[PDB]
């Protein structure tokens, strides 16, 4: 739990951690992770408001299509270095009000 760093200008916790995924539809995904991209200088010509280009990797190579906003839950989540951190992830998932509270490697393209 020494690799978790909270970022301020975007409500996110960076942590090299993989979480199993359960969404509203029956399709289920194994341990995966998110990558957020804070870009306030992004081309938003259309009705785009988000400053974060948030996407998902399944196994570091499998980027799944966004499609609908799946109602994902953290389920069992592993740091892949020390031990399972399920509580340590779910406890700070709330009181954030930002989608994908815990991601890995925010790119911070300014």
């Amino acid at each position: 739990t020494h690799d978790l760093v909270y970022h301020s200008k975007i409500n996110t916790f960076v942590w090299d951690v993989e979480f199993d995924i359960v969404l509203s539809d029956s399709k289920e995904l194994n341990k995966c992770y998110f990558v957020k991209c804070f870009n306030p200088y992004r081309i938003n010509g259309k009705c785009d408001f988000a400053v974060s280009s948030i996407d998902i990797f399944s196994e570091g190579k499998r980027l799944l299509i966004e499609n609908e906003f799946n109602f994902k839950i953290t389920k069992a989540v592993h740091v892949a270095t020390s031990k399972d951190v399920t509580e340590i992830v779910l406890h700070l998932s709330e009181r954030i009000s930002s989608p994908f509270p815990i991601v890995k490697e925010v790119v911070y393209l300014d």
């Binding site: 200008k9 870009n39 992004r42 938003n44 010509g45 009705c47 408001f49 906003f69």
Partner: protein, 642 residues
């Protein structure tokens, strides 16, 4: 006995004997004193005059009226003249010093095996039948090349196999064994002591090279951050320490000790100059006395920044200080150097380019150069060649598609986009489309950006650019090439009207999930009534569930691109929805500041432009920033709400 100041002159100190230097400098100007000198010794005076004017010692301190030293480097390696060094290496060597610089150049092109062999040849042929300077230098360079080979082989064949798939073993195993055997227990500390006693008295100034750390000048660098309210004695020493190592063909210019203080001098100098500015403004005035920052980057400054800095270090430079206030001198020379880098990249990938050590040594400076290029006004042809190289011949193992797009957006900030650059980007998009015909090929990016941003940038710079090639590719589409249709969906604005008409029939809109898929890929621009009715049923479904995308619908309504009024009947639930649909009757006690951290420039501009929420939002932000040190809330407050 004499303090040779780096600014150009010399000052006296501890010369208990006669003042030979003062008399020499006095006779430098008087022609009669020159004439009265003896004939056999006159040529020696001429040689001394040539040496002293070359090294940059002008005059004494009592008459040092002119002291501006224009640094000049004539080394071929500094300017990255690879085409010249290759031709020189192909040319046979006539002497030993020419052989020495051939060895050094061979070391800078990554061919370390040939460089080591040629250094061994020099050692054999110049054992002691000279002044010994070449023998000493070629012993040190040999050891440094051996260290570099060991470090590369412990890393390239150690862990970096995935950087080229399978072990490329750039150095042969027999060669590795030979260099290990020939260099068992080579004492580098005592090497200078093994030289003849005459050498140790004459070339005493070459002692530091045989040391584990020799550049203990960093302790002097602590004078750059003293807050007493110059710095030119450090920059001149940096050039003084670069014209030695890079012009005497020495193999101590690629290690981490050299790169560490160059990354420390060039950072401390710019930071202190940034502190000289923004501090004189406090008591002198913004523009009445704020002429310039003080620092002036030149060709030999940009080259150092390119060669030694990394991307994270450059970003740290940009975050701390505003480099945009620092003008880049000698724009033409920077343009030519960048064009040379682009030519080298183009020639490297197009050819075999299997040689990997030089690739790794040179890709860093190439990336740093094309990163810093945004500060230099590049010529039209030069920019065209730069962009062509960066798009079609830069390896994808180092620069991903997202980083590639970031690089161009960085380059287009300080320069427009004439027809040539947009034509190059159009050709790149065409190449991507032709690559997408393979249904098993997918883009990999570590920045979130993709090929959509290229079309978006083209449209932003040119509102009516219709890529006829893309239109023809769309016309020639089939049903089974689903991935191609998706990719062309991502670039809808760049297609022609008949192309759009043919494409839209392939994939229509469905319910809300596909609706939002089309919105993300920009399928629809004006919200058609059918889309509007589809929206309501989702909200009507939400009411049943309540008795998500709701924030998106509220924001769209706030942006006035949704003109439906019956949705006004559906308020009193989510905070953001009511905020963006009915600011009149919102009770503001439920507002959360975190929302403001997800809004781009235009949304905050529209929020600030509205009267009914400006005061509430600004007082919320002030309350939040009073009790916290968050820079994001203050940044939002000052950029848009003042």
């Amino acid at each position: 006995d004499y303090h040779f100041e780096v600014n150009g002159t010399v000052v006296r100190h501890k010369n208990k004997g006669f003042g030979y230097m003062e008399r020499f400098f006095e006779l430098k100007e008087s022609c009669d004193e020159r004439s009265k000198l003896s004939k056999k010794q006159y040529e020696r005076f001429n040689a001394l005059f040539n040496f002293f004017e070359k090294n940059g010692v002008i005059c004494m301190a009592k008459d040092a009226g002119t002291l501006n030293t224009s640094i000049e480097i004539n080394s071929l390696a500094y300017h990255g003249k690879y085409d010249v060094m290759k031709k020189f290496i192909e040319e046979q060597s006539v002497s030993i010093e020419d052989d020495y610089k051939k060895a050094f150049f061979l070391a800078c092109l990554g061919r370390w095996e040939e460089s080591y062999d040629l250094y061994s040849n020099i050692i054999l042929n110049s054992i002691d039948e000279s002044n010994g300077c070449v023998y000493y230098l070629s012993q040190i360079n040999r050891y440094r090349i051996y260290q570099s080979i060991t470090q590369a082989v412990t890393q390239f064949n150690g862990l970096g196999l995935l950087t080229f798939g399978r072990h490329y073993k750039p150095f042969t195993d027999e060669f590795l064994a030979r260099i290990e055997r020939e260099m068992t227990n080579f004492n580098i500390d005592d090497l200078f002591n093994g030289m003849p006693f005459e050498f140790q008295k004459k070339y005493k100034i070459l002692e530091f090279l045989s040391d584990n750390q020799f550049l203990y000048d960093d302790t002097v660098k602590l004078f750059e951050l003293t807050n007493k309210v110059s710095d030119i004695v450090v920059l001149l020493r940096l050039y003084d320490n670069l014209r030695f190592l890079y012009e005497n063909c020495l193999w101590s210019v690629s290690f981490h000790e050299f790169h560490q203080y160059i990354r420390n001098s060039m950072s401390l100098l710019i930071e202190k100059a940034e502190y000289e500015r923004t501090r004189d403004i406090d008591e002198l005035g913004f523009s009445f006395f704020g002429k310039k920052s003080g620092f002036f980057m030149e060709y030999y400054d940009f080259v150092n920044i390119s060669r030694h800095f990394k991307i994270d270090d450059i970003k740290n430079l940009e975050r701390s200080c505003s480099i945009d206030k620092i003008r880049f001198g000698e724009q033409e020379k920077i343009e030519e150097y960048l064009v040379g880098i682009a030519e080298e990249i183009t020639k490297q990938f197009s050819a075999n380019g299997m040689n990997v050590v030089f690739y790794t040594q040179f890709i860093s400076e190439a990336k740093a150069a094309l990163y810093f290029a945004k500060y230099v006004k590049l010529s039209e042809e030069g920019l065209g060649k730069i962009v062509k190289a960066l798009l079609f011949y830069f390896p994808e193992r180092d620069l991903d598609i997202g980083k590639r797009y970031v690089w161009l957006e960085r380059l287009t900030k300080c320069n427009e986009l004439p027809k040539s650059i947009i034509s190059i980007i159009d050709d790149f998009l065409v190449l991507q489309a032709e690559k997408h015909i393979d249904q098993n090929y997918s883009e990999v990016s570590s920045n979130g950006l993709y090929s959509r941003d290229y079309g978006a940038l083209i449209k932003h710079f040119e509102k009516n650019f219709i890529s006829k090639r893309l239109s023809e590719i769309t016309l020639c589409l089939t049903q089974d090439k689903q991935k191609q249709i998706d990719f062309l969906f991502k670039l809808l604005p760049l297609l022609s009207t008949n192309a759009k008409s043919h494409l839209l029939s392939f994939k229509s809109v469905e319910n809300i999930n596909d609706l939002m898929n089309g919105i993300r890929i920009g399928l629809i621009d004006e919200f058609t009534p059918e889309h509007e009715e589809l929206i309501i049923e989702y909200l009507e479904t939400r009411k049943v569930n309540y008795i998500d995308y709701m924030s998106t619908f509220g924001i769209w309504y706030f942006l006035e691109e949704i003109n439906n009024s019956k949705m006004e009947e559906f308020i009193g639930m989510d905070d953001q929805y009511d905020f963006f649909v009915d600011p009149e009757n919102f009770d503001y006690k439920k507002f959360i500041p975190s929302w403001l951290k997800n809004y781009n420039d235009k949304l905050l501009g529209k929020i600030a432009g509205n009267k009914h929420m400006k005061h509430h939002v600004i007082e919320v932000l002030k309350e939040r920033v009073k009790n916290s040190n968050d820079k994001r809330y203050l940044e939002i407050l000052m950029n848009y709400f003042i």
